[PDB]
Structure 1
């Protein structure tokens, strides 16, 4: 017990990448990104 937590993560970066990869497989558009 008596542990530490914060405004960092757990799955924030993980989830974000799961959801970004979830949207892609689902809501397909006609994309345009700038390199």
Structure 2
């Protein structure tokens, strides 16, 4: 029964968010600094 619960959740996790926004072209070049204050 344990193995049944394992496969049901993951398959549902892949199904969920399938009809949602793909972030495939979002990943690009990234240039930064840290905060306005030096770590306080």
Same fold (TM > 0.5): no
Judging by fraction of residues, say which structure has more helix: 1
More strand by share: 1
> Given the two structures, how large is their TM-score scaled by the length of structure 1?
0.41
TM-score, structure 2 normalization:
0.37
Whichever of the two has the greater Rg, that structure is: 2
